[PDB]
């Protein structure tokens, strides 16, 4: 709107001009048949009335050049003058422009020809404004539909009777006054009054006579005091009654159609009527009948929350409705605590409202449930039942609670017959959609499984690694543990953190041990090991091979991650450590053993033969590594299964340059 | 079982019966024959309107109108012999019969003699046979030429452009008239059946309308008598009935008692058909029904004044324009709906710049799960700072991505025209929506869910890597706001780094179908990343199979030394197991293991006769030794 | 028992079963028709119904990732796809198209499991017929489904 | 929540408001107010 001289079509000063030209068009299209039929040129009394009246429709033509319109393909208001001008010139300009010509002055100043007087019949392109008024009135819900559907059909049966009366008098004027007796009004005599020399009768007697004929003909009464005697009036009343027959059939059809399409009050009324007839036929009680009528009245007054009215509104609008209505009732639920917002936004879409009276039954004892219910209001109770009709009020399910979640995740039948004690506001959620979004969002299904176990401390069904909802979660957690271990193997620290911050666990293992700390320590990525340790990991986790991340760190060879794992509880815990130290003396890789007893296992362990690793070190000559193996080890007096201290074993090696080491622990006794 | 349903199936058999023989029999859809059908329809309309006017208003036609009804009979004598050369589009066996002995028959036992008697000259026969009155009643055989008009209203009732309840109304309005034309002609004929001296005891001889007396009524002009009789018959049919013209005789009283009894039933049938048309509601009241069903639930839930104007805007958008008929489409099954979607959406999805040359099956999996959605101008679809739940493709319209700095500075980032997508750089990523996608002009977005474009993105990993390459081969998103995320999710290894892990987890859990769906699409490796494992190192042995078919597939390399020195025979024999170590040895498994003598001495020392007999039974030589070169007998003789 | 019983009697799944089991089966069937070419099951899905062919020539094909397919069998009349996906609680491995004007009879999985858990001798006969006709390459155990438990 | 459910509810509490005081007010579904509602109906 950068023009400031283009009127908006929803202005409040232009909407007072639309209802002004509507009144001028209701007048000037009801006087136009009366100007054609009952005159042969207007008198001088009506000259000023005809001059202004073609001016209020002459400034409306100018004003339609300055009104913006809504586009049909882009739905934007088009404030451009060169667009609204070419829209007006090709749609409604010509029939409105030559309609407001002074046709009476053109008639009187052309020798009074009758064929230039038929040109004022294009002033009935002003009931276009009444058509637009009724089109605007049908697209407005503030106004009733019994006030609009046949009120526009009790308007064509005003227009087509006034116009038919005017044409029926005009056909009487088309015969000369010498032939007055062969006309419908010239041959008319009602009572003791004779309608002879009828063009000097005043205008309202002629108009009321013609309109009396037209309305009595239109209603198909047809007294026959006024009829057609000519051969042009016969043709006109044939055309007219063959038009008003289908017009009256259309009126009867529209009234019958809006009567057989009753409101919901009448449908509920006949439903309650034959339900009351069934209840009185079956001789029902007093509170039972009131329970039935209350339930069907609750269903009728509360079925308006059905979402099948909304299944053409797009998503991210239906989702905004479900997050405006249901989200504060799902956020305060003890089941969904700790769940991410994506899972709650997936929960709230598939919820259906339900209402129950104080005394109905929702779930029963022997049945496996198919809906997870959330209590909004009400004070529902949980009744376990026995074989001999006993009842035990176990739980009192008030607001902000759920039931049936245990009977879906564990796939068990329901433990409690749930009867309701107040007027409740339950929220249904089917088990299929719930299970589907549980194995879609498994990181929130794990938190749901951790919430269902605690409240009941797993009264039972605790492994509950039985229903798929509890399996599919295990399978997806396993394959995501595989994925996060692959991210931790090579350098994908940002990808590792994005996996962890998406709800992962850096303690779930692979198919054979292999925590992310294991791979991050064997590859020596020190920042990844810092993230795993400060995230919180069991640093002493074992494998299917009996391996710790400290062991893979000292087997790989990165002293940085070796020193970084030992500042926490590194703690080797390696079984068969004695034969492992003896076989690493056997391979004789001295730097691997430097990595081994740097901060680690005790070198006084034994293999299948009861012998220390320094015994097998001092058996071939390994002084460069026997020095390393004696650096922290003690108790050099230890015999074999054969009964041999390593000094006498180092004797017969044939090399004496490592017997220099044997005088070391001779002072510790 | 196609003999049971010859209508639902075998509809248009066309081939083997068009030009069998005889080369003359016209198919009843020829453009030169349907230009004759309208000609004979116009001749039938004239010859059925003129026939009661020839009966009632004349006693023998004059010397004029002689060539007119001569050529009127000639133009139907042509159509008599022309229907021996027109085919037989059939009722039960749906094929146009071309056999010209089933064309001569089915016609001679049908409308032939009623259509051949009606072409005899019945006003030359009348004037030749002494001018007898009962030979002129055979003109009424020519009202059997209204078959050509009632066949026209049967070829129009099965035309889907016009409603059938409107063609029934037009048929009743062509039955209402021509029963007032025929009744006018019979009402004048019943006045001519009295002698001219008893003409004062007729409806027209005793008539005086205005100052004109209808005396000696056989000498008035024909178009005054016809207009008088038709005016009576039409004001009688409309039940107005002024009584200026009424029945006077008993033969006219009887005819009026028949005629108004026919018109009462006909007018009640017309009112019933018009009401049955109107109860099948229009567009405006079907809009207003759910509009008043949706104003309530918006008044009692207390929704805001802007969300209400969005809901009313979308309801007024699904009506009054843009008739989205998916609610009618839901009866169609998933295969034919997928074919409809591949017809309608593949011209739009294939031109999206996100999908620069993916596989056709991947784009098929995209267009299977699409939904059409329309939004008014001013709507916000995905706002900045929220999670993206849907992926949108702009089919047509105009959108606007914006972003704010601190103080609501809504500057135009881009303008998403047709063949554009938004919400794509956050389903690939795991970040918030970075732009407030606002609507400028009336759009036609195609919506794909987030979970569908994760399932079909992880299944089609080559096309997923192609999509990530389409995202990075750009200005690295500096055309929008230069929000660079690493290099997206970078090449994340789904060739070997996760797919070997995926097929290995499929082997570990024991899923044979997932295993063969992975390996029959290629990509069967012999190594896992992060270890030295294999899909033989897992399944086969440790798992011990789950599924017996895990060893026969593809013959993978046995005796692969892993990162911890375990051949799959050793993994199969450690967990004991007795099928894979019975089965692997004929496939050429071996017990290669470093320091195997030391391992055998440790299994002597722990004490496990089952473990050691499974070691020796699956192939092991107990002369291999340890660092002190001690055989397992040297330690099995120790303790 | 006069419309559907000659179809359900000559089914190789229900061979050796008691007549009362077949009389309980035939009540809950739903007559269905399909023209030659639509799709009623897909590649990965635990199937929702057990079907019986009466007159038709449906095909069961497995699709791959790169658009290809190959038909593992040709399900003619008196055949019953479904069941192995139901009573073993596995996904139906074949996309079952149709090649003729078929004449199927539906039977939902919950009612099938109810009749199987009530009449368990005929359930054992059905388990035996599936173990020999499919040859039971594995899952002779098949305790994954609660029907067998 | 239950105040929305006014006429669709318990609805039988006339018993306490019957004859509090004022000693003259006739109940609508009386019997002597059904020999008046037909007498002055035909009047
Ligand atoms: K009348």
Swiss-Prot record, chain A:
Residues involved in a nucleoside 3',5'-cyclic phosphate binding: 335-457
Keywords recorded for this protein, A-Z: ANK repeat, Ion channel, Ion transport, Membrane, Potassium, Potassium channel, Potassium transport, Repeat, Transmembrane, Transmembrane helix, Transport, Voltage-gated channel
Keyword Membrane among UniProt keywords: yes
A single MF term (Gene Ontology): monoatomic ion transmembrane transporter activity
Residue intervals annotated with topology Cytoplasmic: 68-90, 139-152, 256-669
Per-repeat ranges for ANK: 477-508, 512-541, 545-574, 576-605, 609-638, 642-669
Compartments (UniProt record): Membrane
UniProt-recorded name of the protein: Potassium channel GORK
Encoding gene (name): GORK
Span of the entire protein shown here: 52 to 720 of 820
UniProtKB/Swiss-Prot annotation, chain D:
Induction (record text): Up-regulated under drought, salt stress and cold conditions. Induced by abscisic acid (ABA) treatment in roots and shoots but not in guard cells.
Top-rank lineage group of the source organism: Eukaryota
Subcellular location: Membrane
Tissue: Expressed in guard cell-containing tissues, in root epidermal cells and in root hairs. Detected in vascular cells of the root and shoot.
The family this protein is said to belong to: Belongs to the potassium channel family. Plant (TC 1.A.1.4) subfamily.
UniProt free text on domains: The segment S4 is probably the voltage-sensor and is characterized by a series of positively charged amino acids. The pore-forming region H5 is enclosed by the transmembrane segments S5 and S6 in the Shaker-type (1P/6TM) and contains the GYGD signature motif which seems to be involved in potassium selectivity. The KHA domain (rich in hydrophobic and acidic residues) present in the C-terminal part is likely to be important for tetramerization.
Function per UniProt: Major selective outward-rectifying potassium channel of the guard cell membrane. Involved in regulation of stomatal movements according to the water status. Assuming opened or closed conformations in response to the voltage difference across the membrane, the channel is activated by depolarization. Conductance of the channel is modulated in a potassium-dependent fashion. May interact with the cytoskeleton or with regulatory proteins.
Description of how the protein assembles with itself and partners: The potassium channel is probably composed of a homo- or heterotetrameric complex of pore-forming subunits.
The name this protein goes by in its record: Potassium channel GORK
Organism: Arabidopsis thaliana (Mouse-ear cress)
Full-protein residues shown: 33 to 75 of 820
């Amino acid at each position: 709107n950068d023009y400031k001289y283009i009127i908006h079509p929803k202005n409040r000063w232009y909407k007072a001009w639309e209802m002004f030209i509507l009144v001028w068009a209701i007048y000037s299209s009801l006087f136009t048949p009366m100007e054609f039929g009952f005159f042969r040129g207007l008198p001088e009394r009506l000259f000023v009335l005809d001059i202004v009246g073609q001016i209020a429709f002459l400034v409306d033509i100018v004003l339609q050049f300055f009104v913006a319109y809504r586009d049909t393909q882009t739905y934007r208001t088009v404030y451009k003058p060169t667009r609204i001008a070419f829209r007006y010139l090709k749609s409604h300009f010509l029939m409105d422009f030559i309609g407001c010509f002074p046709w009476d002055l053109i008639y009187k100043a052309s020798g009074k020809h009758e064929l230039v007087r038929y040109l004022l019949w294009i002033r009935l392109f002003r009931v276009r404004k009444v058509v637009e008024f009724f089109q605007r009135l049908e697209k407005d819900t503030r106004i009733n539909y019994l006030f609009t559907r046949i009120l526009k059909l009790l308007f064509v049966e005003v227009y087509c009777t006034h116009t038919a009366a005017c044409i029926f008098y005009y056909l009487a004027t088309t015969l000369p006054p010498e032939n007055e007796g062969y006309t419908w009004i010239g041959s008319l005599k009602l009572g003791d009054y004779s309608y002879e020399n009828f063009r000097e009768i005043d205008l309202w007697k002629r108009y009321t006579t013609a309109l009396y004929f037209a309305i009595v003909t239109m209603a198909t009464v047809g007294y026959g005091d006024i009829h057609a005697v000519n051969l042009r009036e016969m043709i006109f009343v044939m055309i007219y009654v063959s038009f008003d027959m289908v017009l009256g059939a259309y009126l009867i059809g529209n009234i019958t159609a809006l009567i057989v399409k009753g409101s919901n009050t009448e449908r509920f009324r006949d439903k309650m009527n034959d339900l009351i007839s069934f209840m009185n036929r079956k001789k029902l009680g007093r509170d039972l009948r009131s329970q039935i009528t209350g339930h069907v009245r609750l269903q009728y007054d509360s079925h308006y929350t059905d979402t099948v009215m909304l299944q053409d509104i797009p998503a991210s609008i239906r989702a905004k409705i479900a997050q405006l209505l249901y989200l504060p009732y799902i956020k305060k639920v003890p089941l969904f605590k700790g769940c991410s917002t994506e899972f709650i936004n997936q929960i709230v879409i598939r919820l259906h409202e339900e209402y129950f009276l104080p005394g109905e039954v929702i779930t029963e004892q022997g049945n496996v449930v198919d809906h997870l219910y959330f209590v909004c209001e009400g004070l529902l109770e949980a009744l376990v039942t026995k074989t001999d009709g006993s009842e035990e009020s176990v739980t009192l399910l008030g607001p902000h609670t759920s039931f049936g979640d245990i009977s879906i995740i564990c796939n068990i039948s329901q433990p409690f017959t749930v009867r309701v004690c107040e007027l409740c506001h339950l929220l249904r959620l089917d088990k299929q959609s719930f299970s589907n979004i549980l194995e879609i969002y498994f990181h929130d299904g794990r938190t749901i499984l951790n919430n269902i176990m605690e409240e009941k401390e797993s009264n039972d069904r605790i492994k509950k690694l039985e229903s798929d909802i509890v399996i599919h979660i295990g399978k997806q957690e396993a394959e995501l543990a595989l994925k996060v271990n692959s991210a931790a193997f090579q350098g994908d620290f940002y990808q590792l953190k994005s996996l962890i911050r998406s709800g992962a666990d850096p303690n779930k293992t692979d198919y054979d041990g292999r925590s992310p700390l294991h791979l991050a320590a064997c590859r020596g990525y020190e920042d990844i090991t810092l993230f795993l340790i400060q995230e919180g990991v069991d640093v002493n986790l074992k494998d299917k091979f009996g391996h710790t991340p400290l062991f893979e760190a000292v087997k790989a060879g990165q002293e940085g991650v070796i020193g970084l794992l030992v500042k926490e509880g590194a703690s080797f815990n390696l079984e068969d450590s004695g034969n492992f130290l003896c076989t690493t003396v056997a391979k004789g890789d001295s730097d691997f053993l430097k990595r081994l007893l740097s901060s680690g296992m005790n070198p006084n362990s034994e293999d299948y033969d009861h012998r220390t690793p320094l015994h097998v070190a001092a058996s071939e000559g390994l002084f460069l590594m026997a020095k390393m193996l004696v650096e922290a080890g003690a108790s050099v007096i230890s015999k074999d299964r054969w009964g041999n201290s390593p000094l006498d074993e180092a004797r017969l090696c044939g090399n004496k340059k490592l017997i220099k080491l044997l005088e070391d622990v001779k002072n510790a006794q | 079982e196609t003999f049971r349903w010859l209508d639902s199936s075998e509809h248009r058999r066309i081939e083997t019966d068009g030009h069998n023989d005889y080369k003359y029999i016209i198919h009843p859809k020829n453009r030169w024959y349907k230009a004759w059908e309208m000609f004979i329809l116009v001749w039938a309309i004239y010859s059925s309107l003129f026939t009661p006017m020839e009966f009632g208003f004349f006693r023998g036609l004059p010397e004029r109108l002689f060539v007119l009804d001569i050529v009127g009979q000639i133009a139907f004598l042509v159509d008599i012999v022309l229907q021996f050369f027109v085919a037989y589009r059939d009722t039960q066996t749906y094929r146009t019969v071309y056999k010209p002995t089933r064309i001569a028959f089915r016609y001679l036992k049908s409308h032939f003699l009623m259509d051949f008697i009606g072409c005899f000259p019945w006003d030359l026969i009348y004037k030749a046979s002494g001018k007898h009155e009962l030979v002129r009643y055979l003109l009424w055989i020519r009202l059997f030429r209204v078959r050509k008009v009632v066949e026209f209203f049967q070829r129009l009732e099965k035309d889907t452009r016009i409603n059938y309840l409107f063609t029934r109304i037009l048929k009743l309005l062509f039955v209402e008239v021509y029963c007032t034309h025929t009744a006018a002609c019979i009402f004048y004929y019943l006045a001519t059946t009295l002698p001219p001296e008893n003409e004062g005891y007729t409806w027209i001889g005793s008539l005086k309308l205005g100052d004109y007396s209808y005396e000696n009524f056989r000498e008035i002009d024909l178009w005054k008598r016809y207009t008088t009789a038709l005016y009576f018959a039409i004001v009688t049919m409309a039940t107005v009935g002024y009584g200026d013209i009424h029945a006077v005789n008993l033969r006219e009283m009887i005819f009026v008692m028949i005629y108004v009894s026919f018109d009462m039933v006909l007018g009640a049938y017309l009112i019933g058909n018009i009401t049955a048309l109107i109860v099948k509601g229009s567009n405006t009241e079907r809009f207003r029904d759910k509009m008043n069903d949706l104003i309530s639930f918006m008044n009692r839930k207390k929704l805001g004044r802007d969300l209400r104007s969005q809901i009313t805007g979308h309801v007024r958008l699904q009506y009054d324009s843009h008739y989205t008929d998916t609610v009618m489409l839901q009866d169609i099954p998933a295969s034919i709906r997928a074919k409809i979607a591949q017809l309608l959406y593949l011209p739009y999805i294939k031109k999206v710049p996100l999908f620069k040359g993916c596989s056709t099956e991947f784009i098929n999996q995209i267009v299977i799960r699409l939904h059409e959605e329309y939004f008014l101008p001013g709507e916000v679809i995905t706002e900045q700072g929220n999670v993206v739940d849907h992926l949108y493709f702009v089919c047509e319209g105009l959108l606007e991505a914006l972003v704010t700095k601190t103080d609501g500075s809504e500057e135009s980032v881009t303008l998403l025209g047709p063949h554009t997508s938004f919400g794509d750089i956050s389903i690939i990523c795991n970040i918030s929506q970075p732009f407030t996608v606002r609507v400028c002009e009336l759009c036609h977005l195609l919506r794909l869910d987030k979970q569908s474009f994760s399932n079909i993105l992880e299944i089609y990993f080559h096309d997923g890597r192609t999509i990530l390459n389409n995202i990075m081969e750009e200005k690295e998103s500096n055309d929008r706001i230069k929000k660079l995320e690493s290099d997206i999710v970078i090449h994340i290894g789904k060739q070997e780094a996760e797919l070997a892990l995926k097929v290995n987890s499929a082997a570990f859990q024991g899923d044979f179908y997932q295993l063969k769906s992975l390996i029959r699409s290629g990509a069967d490796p012999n190594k896992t990343d992060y270890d030295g494992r294999s899909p033989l190192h897992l399944a086969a042995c440790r798992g011990y199979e789950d599924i017996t078919l895990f060893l026969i597939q593809e013959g993978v390399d046995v005796n692969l030394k892993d990162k911890f020195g375990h051949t799959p025979l050793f993994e199969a024999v450690k967990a004991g197991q007795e099928g894979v170590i019975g089965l692997l040895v004929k496939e050429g498994a071996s017990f290669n293991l470093e320091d195997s003598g030391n391992f055998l001495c440790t299994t002597v020392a722990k004490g496990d006769s089952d473990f050691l007999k499974r070691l020796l039974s699956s192939g092991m030589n107990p002369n291999s030794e340890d660092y002190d070169h001690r055989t397992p007998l040297h330690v099995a003789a120790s303790e």
